Amino acid sequence: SMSVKKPKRDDSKDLALCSMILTEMETHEDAWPFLLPVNLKLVPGYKKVIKKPMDFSTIREKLSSGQYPNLETFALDVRLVFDNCETFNEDDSDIGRAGHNMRKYFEKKWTDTFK
Structure with missing residues (x-):
């Protein structure tokens, strides 16, 4: 609450770490259905x-x-x-x-990166 803070969790590496995870997801062999937006004209x-x-x-x-x-x-x-x-x-x-x-x-x- 006002002037009453939990201790500061270091969030300064979050951006880089989410990027790394995202890179790992992009390069997985089963990423192919997910790499690009679903084509809304072509998928009824x-x-x-x-x-x-x-x-x-x-x-x-x-x-x-x-x-x-x-x-x-x-x-x-x-x-x-x-x-x-x-x-x-x-x-x-x-x-x-x-x-x-x-x-x-x-x-x-x-979990392994953040919990």
Whole structure:
């Protein structure tokens, strides 16, 4: 509260560390469904069904241009990528599986880097 602060957690390496994690996600073999925005002209259903599209390139641009106020808003956009994937894709499809694997991969790196 006013004039009563928890001790300052060092957040000065967060930007660089989220970049590293994002690089690791971009270079994973199962990143391919997630590298670019879903083409809304060519994929029936996507536009109406997925209210907040997100992909790695868009996260990369947001990160690079100071559009994440902190590491939580960054993790929200990463998760949003996998939540959209689960909304639109059956678990037993190549994309469905890629989403589950990428999420697992993200979540481990997040814990090991920050928790």
